[PDB]
Design a protein around this nucleic acid. Structure first.
Length: 48
DNA sequence: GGAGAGTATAGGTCGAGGGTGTACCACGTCTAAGTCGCAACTGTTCC
């Protein structure tokens, strides 16, 4: 779910500590999500 | 009969370098190592 407080900083400005922490949630969860996605995709490929 | 629950199944590929032994005694029973003799067996040495 979206956090009601946006990150206003661009990476050119560099992010405050709180903004960086906030961004880590979606970054990491996206990494693990890709990890699972590439697995289930292969399973479906095997069944097909 | 018919519904919940309890049990069964599945869950990416290829690579590189690493990785383990608390605890009864007092004995007889057997074995794990032998040194050691004749046959049995390899070898020369001829005529």
């Amino acid at each position: 779910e979206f956090i009601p407080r946006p990150v206003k900083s661009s990476f050119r400005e560099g992010l405050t500590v709180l903004e960086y922490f906030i961004n880590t949630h979606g970054a990491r969860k996206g990494l693990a999500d890709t990890a699972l996605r590439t697995a289930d995709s292969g399973y479906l490929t095997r069944r097909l």
